[PDB]
């Protein structure tokens, strides 16, 4: 009731909220909203991220859609931006990635559950390794760090403050008041 | 209990799924029979669909470790892990009943939730163990390693005469 | 327990559905009875609704291996796996009580979730098993394979005299 | 509230979303949507696929409906297109099948679960064999590969990248920018 | 426990619902007591609410097959399946206590889901079982076929004197 | 949200969907829809069937309603038409029964589960036999085959392809393109 | 929902549906609909019955309401009219009780469950006997058969075909086409 | 356990709810104690809240059929069925401990779902059962039929002295 | 129906309610409402708090959003304000934090649940200690107390009355009548 | 459906209902309704109470809001007014507390469930004692009785009739007909 | 039970997960066997997937407190907690069968439900526990402490010969 109404009134101003674990449904909704807002190709889109992570394919779909449209996408980190949500936050257009002063950013490596015969398990393990390598490459591309350091740090979780994230390259600026957002 | 009475006639049963407890019981029985005079054979009857694999290996090297011969008799069915133990008896002393069925196939597992590194390590161990089981089965049979690799990829089911021809058993007994 | 006392009298009971544990127990009793003097008959009473088909064949093979004969007495109800074991006794020594009923029907199974190849292999094995049971029942009776195939498609329930006429039972006993 | 609104607004632009396992309900819904959009006889239809597969009969109904209507259908793979969803993606009109750069495609052979007597199991096993052969034939027809290659390749699970899928024949092009699609 | 002590006194207790396990136990005791001298009677006390119909028939056939006489006394209550066994004792040797009650009624079943052919076969066998049970009860009583068929249409509860008059029992014992 | 709007806009064009197991609820709904569309007695009604079958009485009510109204009923088989759904598919007006090229038709004999005393079981078994005979006779009437052939063929499960179904007599034509229906 | 809409239009014309077990809720909704349609004391009311029966008191309330209002009530049996649904179907105004050609009708006697002390069981058993006698009397009144015949027939379940129901007196006519009802 | 030792002392316990198993056990104990010298009394201690009717009547009929005297001692509590058994001992040999409490009330049941005819038959059965219990209680007490009917309409609770005055017991024992 | 309309009118009056445990959903909703009400740069926002607290990251998001917008936020403590709720109540703009006369306030140190290997547990324990230190610093900044006093008081649970909270520095004033409300 | 509508009309008539156990949800709704109705500061507010009571904090928030607004509150006791509901009923403005003739008023003492170490349990027990003392003080203030009598009387459960409650001081009058309310 | 007979031969089985009950049994058996002649050795066979650390430490301390030598035979598999106990035998008397697998990895836990202070205390405890276990394992092997730091960061699985080379196992036995 109230939530749908306030979210519609916010979407009327080109603002998208991603505030739950990333599964197929939420990724489908975010892709639909981005495609809908892509009708006007000269106005930017703001995405607010407070998520603990989620699935890999759904996040890949969201990332591809973000890189697909002509409109620039401004990513804002509020609260928690962990696991693949961090990847989506770092995937915004350069110069337009921000985080609030008391936000937490976490870097993680993929996890999966496998069951079947040895050949099927071999195939799925190879695919999981390929997915991990792809995520490492994309993170290295988006933050500017070398692919070696990202591998080392993603090994076991690494938590980052706003200023630490800005120094690392995950975000571009830390905002305090409303003068900073474009 | 008839099981103890048959124990006095050095007869051991494997009639359940292979697990840690059953494997422990089987090795305890084998060690107890070995502690007796080492000049009498041990007869083991197998009717099992398989089970845990490390427990199977424990039973296997327990049989390979003791001095007296172990005679394996197929019964009802001997599938997967049970087939490995049936073919592990001493040469010339592996037998099957006329209406028993034998099945062989590759190991199955479920590498649980973990990081990429953990899944890599577990999958490497699983591939190693599949190779080890295939080599072990190749040594106990007349067939080469490549043929055993080819025939294990899917489920293959053999009868008594087919098992005799293939090499999983030595003879099929119809009467005493 | 009266079961041990009847064991001293060479009497074996099959009053539950055929499973792995029951079949293991039954053949243990059979081997124990065969271990002593082989010039005495064994009496098996069957009151069972059927069960697993591998344990079925385990008990059947044990019955056809021992030298001592196994007289089989029908009991209350003998269906499916019970009927084949009842007809598997030594010729001239298969009996039924006057008010017992016998049922024969084709095997049932559930080919579990798997790929197309696995289901193909399992279905081929199921057809082979059904044909083997058909032939086995045909040999122990007087009827040919085609007639047993025709009568096995659906459930067929026979009384004592009907079973005597068909060939599943050699005689019906009323008193001792 | 939000999802229904954005989906209706997108359907007004002739865009259909298939972002869940394929069952009777979703197949019925996509068939109904295609039938309605068939009222306008010369405008194309876009289908976005992010699904892990589903039931055989429902997917065959969707395939037959897509091949039925006069309008061309453009299939787009975002995220995951696995098992029968891959078959639906490859079933689009020639020259109008694309995938995103991080799209990820899987080819899978059918699976089923049966119970009953020996005769019923025999009948159902024969039907499953027939279904597998039909799917292999349709995939061979749509992808331009020989039937033997498809049969051998689909025995296990094979995973495809966007460029590998393009070379294989499942799709015709890989998007990077909105200017690359009609 | 007192059950074995009473077994030495050749009395048998049936105080549970008739099932496969209970019927197996009861006829095992009957055969055991047969194994002793065949010139001593056996006493059976029946306090049961009914049970399965094949196990009932197994116990009945064992009682009719075993040589020495079987004494049946009613025990608190004797429902449908218990009534058949109570009336199955040797003529002139069926008794009841003054405050025990007897119930007779037609069989009940749950024909499982299946094709129309299977339902037809099962229903035909059900009708045959009903007719056979009514005929068996009519032979053990003075009342004819028509009266018995009429009376088990619904539940009919009889007291001790009513049971004696109808023919279910032979006498009512108030003291030793 | 979506499904109601799509189905309403389709029913506005005299399209009825039967895409779930046949029970009392959707049989009641289909009877209501047929009665409503019966207001105009000159236009035909199209019924789309994708169902695995269901209860006997509900399907019989649907059949009687279809034979009741004056408007002709055209039936389309898409996906699966099995058990009682096959009976409804072949119950359409002669010359107006079609199936899609990849549709599967299944003929199946009735099944039921009873409980109670012997007399009640006898009565219910007689009623089940009566229903089986009625279904065989109605299928023979609507198909053109003899009653004996239908009785022998329905003992087990027989699967039919579209062309096999057309040859058998359950359907009249196989649907390929939009020029088919009037 | 679509079902709500079609039911609204059907009730608007004049139709009332009863297609589920008779409980307190559906009896209340049937009584409300009858009371509202009683606004115009001249036009008739149509009631369609497809139900396996239900609670005795709710059906008694429905029967009393049908016998109360001045408008004539036409009863139509489609599919199953069993247990107390048969009683409701036979309770329509004389000359306006019909059934479809394949409509199947069952006559049943009441059943109940009881618990408590031996003094309460006596009262509840007497009340159950009174209810059974009342139902037998009402059925004898409405079908024209003698009370003894009705009691003897309802002692055990009897199943009725449409023509057998007409001969027995439960209904007045069997319709086949749209020209048979007012 | 002390239960066997008390068995050697001719002491029987009823300290649970009345049920088929407990009634069968108590009856076995009573018959076994009959097998001993028939000139020695039997002591039964009752601490029970009641239970099923038929088991109660079985125990009552055993006590009335057993030849030696059965002395009953109420201890803890004796309600419903337990009150019937406590008052059913031989006259002059029914006792209760000073702080025990006794309760009497009418039978309770739940006539399950069924047709009207079945419920009519069961209700008549219940009324007959209630009348029979009233008559039995009136026989064992000094009170007439009408008074016993009036008192058991609802729960009436009596202490030891009140029970002695009413007639449910014969004496209150404090110290041996 | 009722339960959303009154909230909508209150939001139209610039009143926000926070009366359930703070989680991701409600933090997202409160952030959306604050962003919407920020459309007018010059009107204050009143927030009513009756909650037992909740997740730390959600409270951080709400706190950052409250400190973000240009409009002053007036916090009213009603009922219970414990753990995170107390921190949010004390986070209002200076001179505009209030509580009702019977309002009850609790100060409580963070708690969490961990699982995994020793290294992961070490990392998460360090992060939890960092979070506790940050909360102590923010509370000391807002209430004007020293760090040592706050970190000593929060070791156990301390309960505050309205006047005790005012003396401590958590709130600014306690009213009894609507005259004193800004 | 119906309930929301009738409650909306009653709220338009300045009537508030409290007919469920008092918990945070119902307490936030009633406080919202009171704040909304406080827009017009000259019309009275009527509150009907039929509740068994609930949590102390929620009821205390309701009490504070009732004492907060400028409008007079008239409390009507109907059905049951127990525990905290009695406290709210007695909290109305003097001279405007009423009860129906067959109303029931129950005075109860607080109960709670505690767990934890022996140092936390001490704090929570002290807080519970403080809450009980505050409740007794407020009840004594609103009833006119001495604190000692209230403390003695609420040790166990005491039930009150309407006239007994009026004599005790919890209500001001007992009403029968429509001339009672001002 | 063969376990008692093996107890007579001074062999101890550890074939389940390490828990409080299993550790209690094992250390009770070790104390018992210490009570007899202190010059005979003790044989322990380990096939365990590991378990609790405190029970592990109890067994380890009992092993080093008991005077006669304890020889350990790796078998089937020896996971983390099993590896520590397996390597805890007396030097020169630690053995493994040819097909056994050995796994070592760091401790795991759930320092979870709690405030900040409790989690801090538990985390310091866990770090101390890990350091102590690693130091203990380093003393029983030839490798330095830093190598063990690096090696149990993730799972590392060793075969029989690899275990011999590393230092976990003294010698690998193929036959007696």
Author numbering:
A (entry chain E), D (entry chain F), F (entry chain G), G (entry chain A), I (entry chain D), J (entry chain C): 31 to 212
B (entry chain M), C (entry chain N), E (entry chain H), H (entry chain I), K (entry chain L): 52 to 227
How did the manuscript describe this experimental structure?
The Clp protease system is important for maintaining proteostasis in bacteria. It consists of ClpP serine proteases and an AAA+ Clp-ATPase such as ClpC1. Here, we present cryo-EM structures of the substrate-bound ClpC1:shClpP1P2 from Streptomyces hawaiiensis, and shClpP1P2 in complex with ADEP1, a natural compound produced by S. hawaiiensis and known to cause over-activation and dysregulation of the ClpP proteolytic core chamber.
Removal of the N-terminal flexible regions (first 29 residues removed in shClpP1 and first 49 residues removed in shClpP2) improved solubility of the expressed recombinant proteins. Since the truncated proteins yielded poor homogeneity in the assembly of shClpP1P2, single mutations of the conserved catalytic residue (S113A in shClpP1 and S131A in shClpP2) were further introduced to stabilize the stacked ring structure by attenuation of the complex activity. The reconstruction of the assembled shClpP1P2 chamber was obtained at a resolution of 2.88 Å with an imposed C7 symmetry. Since there is almost no difference between the two shClpP1P2 reconstructions that were obtained above from two data sets (RMSD ~0.594 Å), the reconstruction with a better resolution was used for the following structure determination and analysis. In the apo form of shClpP1P2, the hydrophobic cleft is covered by the C-terminus of shClpP1/P2, which may protect the complex against the hydrophilic environment. Our results show that shClpP1 can only form a heptameric ring structure, and the handle domain specialty of shClpP1 may prohibit it from forming a homo-tetradecameric structure.
